Design an enzyme around this catalytic site. Sequence first.
Site, mmCIF file in Angstrom:
data_model
loop_
_atom_site.group_PDB
_atom_site.id
_atom_site.type_symbol
_atom_site.label_atom_id
_atom_site.label_comp_id
_atom_site.label_asym_id
_atom_site.label_seq_id
_atom_site.Cartn_x
_atom_site.Cartn_y
_atom_site.Cartn_z
ATOM 1 C CG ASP A 114 7.387 33.884 41.206
ATOM 2 O OD1 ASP A 114 7.285 35.125 41.153
ATOM 3 O OD2 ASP A 114 7.138 33.130 40.235
ATOM 4 C CD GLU A 138 3.381 36.688 43.147
ATOM 5 O OE1 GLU A 138 3.836 35.646 42.626
ATOM 6 O OE2 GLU A 138 3.268 37.764 42.523
HETATM 7 CL CL LIG Z 1 5.137 39.851 46.141
#
Ligand SMILES: [Cl-]
EC number: 3.2.1.1
Length: 496
Positions: A197, A233
């Site tokens: 993330d 990401e």
């Molecule tokens: Cl994603």
Amino acid sequence: QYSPNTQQGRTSIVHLFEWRWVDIALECERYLAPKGFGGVQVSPPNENVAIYNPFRPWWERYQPVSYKLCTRSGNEDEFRNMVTRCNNVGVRIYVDAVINHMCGNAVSAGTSSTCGSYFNPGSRDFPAVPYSGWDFNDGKCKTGSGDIENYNDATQVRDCRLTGLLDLALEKDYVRSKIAEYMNHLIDIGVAGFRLDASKHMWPGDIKAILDKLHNLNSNWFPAGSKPFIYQEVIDLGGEPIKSSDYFGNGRVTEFKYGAKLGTVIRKWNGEKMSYLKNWGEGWGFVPSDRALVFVDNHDNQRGHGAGGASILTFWDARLYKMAVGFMLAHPYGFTRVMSSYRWPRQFQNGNDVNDWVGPPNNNGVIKEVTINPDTTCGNDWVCEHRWRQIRNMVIFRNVVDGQPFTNWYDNGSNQVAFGRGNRGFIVFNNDDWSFSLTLQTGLPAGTYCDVISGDKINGNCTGIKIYVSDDGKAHFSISNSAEDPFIAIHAESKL
Ligand SMILES: [Cl-]
Ligand SMILES: [Ca+2]
């Protein structure tokens, strides 16, 4: 880090967004394994802030309190049970690793957390890890607010708080080791890999130093020396000092250009047409295919506030969404992730969905079980796009044609296109405002093929449309512009 570690012949993962661990375990066994899904991206398994204003938003799970595996999805026992049961049927688990930050700096101190752990954002105190003020970037960040203000400065994007989230000092071996401890806990339980993330907000070198500490995958399920699949990401639409390519040494990257562009094309916005898709992939300036994690929508941008904006196709857009997902699953570019969503009371004002925060279906905060309807769709406001026949059968299409080259492209110069994958599959789209009736070279062996969009092959029969491929590989296709699903797909395993 670039290999998904899926079972051979399984080419996609599904995001079961906000699902409970016991529901995912069942889903692996009753659906994902027999239907050839490769794996599941799970919501963050680690303890997060319980945010009561607004009431339990989905995004509270992106604000860590600790690394205890204790969430609204379940406890550690349920998490372990899910990973075991899923791996035992050949369906992998990928964890959404929230490692750039702890919670919002303005969150009230206390026990409002999914495992009841104490934490104090103001004093930078997270005793359940433990983290303290020494473990955050307060001193390092050079901006006036202490938050990221300028994406032209690569340093502050990494060293300052993303929307005020306490930013971990990932240069410190202590912090790197606490994160690795968490990730190794998960690997040894049996997870196959990670979504990292907010990777844009971490230095590639700090990510590397964390990955350097990780175990090989659990040797009961994975060949020795197997490494966790890493997809980072990074939302990079271009024009900034930070590029997706900066992360290639660590693993794959999310290609957010993919869904933005595909959404625009299928909506026929901004003069874009499906015929332009002939060079789809790197030709459109995306990352190399072997570094791409692709998708039509994700959990954030399906709410319309992401990149890019309103062009993103979602289940709300079901007809065009199935087409976009179908094109993605047929096309060889990238490793594919299918979204699986819940419904929420979308309410637009001023171009904004004021309910875009709403968390999963719940009774006073307790997430509702996924129920299965007789027709195999889901109840309790779970959308279950991955169970839609048109999507699930394209997941299988992608398995069937794995490795086969993009070939036998056709376009009409506007929005009617078709292409094959080797001798194993063929797909036809009509997105124009008139009918498509034409004979095309499918590259397939002669025979009768079930269209897997309108129906299924069962027991020497088709429940939908039948396509007839002659001995020269040609088949006639008829698709009205008013068709419920204006595309047709056939493959080696849909042949009678
Ligand atoms: Cl994603
Ligand atoms: Ca950071």
